[PDB]
Amino acid sequence: EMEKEFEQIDKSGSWAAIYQDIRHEASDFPSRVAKLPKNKNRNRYRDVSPFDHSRIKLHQEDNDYINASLIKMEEAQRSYILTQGPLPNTVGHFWEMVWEQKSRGVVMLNRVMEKGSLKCAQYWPQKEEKEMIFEDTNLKLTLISEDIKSYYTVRQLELENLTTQETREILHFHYTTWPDFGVPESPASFLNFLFKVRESGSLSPEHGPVVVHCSAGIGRSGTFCLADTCLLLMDKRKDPSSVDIKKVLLEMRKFRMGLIQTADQLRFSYLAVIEGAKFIMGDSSVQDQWKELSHED
Numbered sequence: 001e002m003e004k005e006f007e008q009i010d011k012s013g014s015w016a017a018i019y020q021d022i023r024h025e026a027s028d029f030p031s032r033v034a035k036l037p038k039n040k041n042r043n044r045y046r047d048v049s050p051f052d053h054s055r056i057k058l059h060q061e062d063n064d065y066i067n068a069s070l071i072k073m074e075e076a077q078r079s080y081i082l083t084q085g086p087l088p089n090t091v092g093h094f095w096e097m098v099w100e101q102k103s104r105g106v107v108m109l110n111r112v113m114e115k116g117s118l119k120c121a122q123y124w125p126q127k128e129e130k131e132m133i134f135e136d137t138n139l140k141l142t143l144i145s146e147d148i149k150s151y152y153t154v155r156q157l158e159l160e161n162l163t164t165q166e167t168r169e170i171l172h173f174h175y176t177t178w179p180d181f182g183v184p185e186s187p188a189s190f191l192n193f194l195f196k197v198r199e200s201g202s203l204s205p206e207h208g209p210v211v212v213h214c215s216a217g218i219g220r221s222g223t224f225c226l227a228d229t230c231l232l233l234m235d236k237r238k239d240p241s242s243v244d245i246k247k248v249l250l251e252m253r254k255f256r257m258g259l260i261q262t263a264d265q266l267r268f269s270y271l272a273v274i275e276g277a278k279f280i281m282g283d284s285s286v287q288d289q290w291k292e293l294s295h296e297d
């Protein structure tokens with residue numbers, strides 16, 4: 001059981017050690033398309049590349065490349081697209097991907113500016129009456145509504161294919177107090193946010209995969225997918241002992257490198273799953289408590 005593994009590693013202070021063994025066991029696959037010279041300005045970081053086997057391809061003949069990976073968790077029947085924060089020049093590619101993959105939700109785990117630097121382009125409209133047109137990909141995006149909580153925001157966007165005049169409603173879930181290379185306040189507000197995404201239908205098999213991003217799409221994004229998948233597997237098995245977090249993480253790392261970027265993100269992941277297990281095992285009331293301790297009011 002993970003709760004006892006947690007106490008062992010915590011008492012022995014072995015997190016940096018567990019983390020390094022995950023690093024050493026992690027898959028390595030070619031990322032040849034990412035490293036082509038014509039794709040240099042489509043990557044936010046030179047050392048974070050999608051693997052060729054799991055990369056999302058854009059449906060445009062010129063250049064199909066985006067820094068995005070499909071994570072497919074077969075047993076949990078969950079799939080996620082993990083991507084970098086879009087660049088000024090890839091905002092159009094980002095929304096094209098959302099359109100082509102039939103995603104219903106975008107989960108953003110960073111602020112546009114962190115530590116006095118830009119982590120992401122402003123890729124959605126700030127005001128209802130000021131819509132965004134992406135000329136390169138022939139898409140229009142309108143802000144429909146915005147609901148602000150203390151530490152996260154939920155926006156209703158309308159995405160229109162200008163080529164075909166079809167429109168879709170996209171939900172933008174913006175977690176607004178998660179530091180880069182860091183961990184949420186307590187897992188409470190984290191979990192509260194995760195259960196909000198689930199409640200929306202965005203993670204449901206009726207829709208294309210949810211798009212998840214932070215700055216590089218591996219750290220904070222990794223922590224989101226790892227907690228969701230572990231809780232689901234727990235749910236499907238009704239057995240907290242049967243879930244090995246370290247094995248699930250290594251499976252996900254077959255699809256995108258570097259998921260979980262620090263030993264404290266690994267520790268937080270355990271803490272999020274352990275706390276979340278209360279709910280999965282039948283204490284439905286624990287969800288009301290999370291809203292309270294989150295102070296989302």
Ligand SMILES: O=C(O)COCc1ccccc1
Nearest residue numbers: 045180181214216219220221
């Ligand atoms: O904490 C995160 O979610 C992402 O980490 C930033 C990063 C890590 C490695 C390489 C480039 C950027």
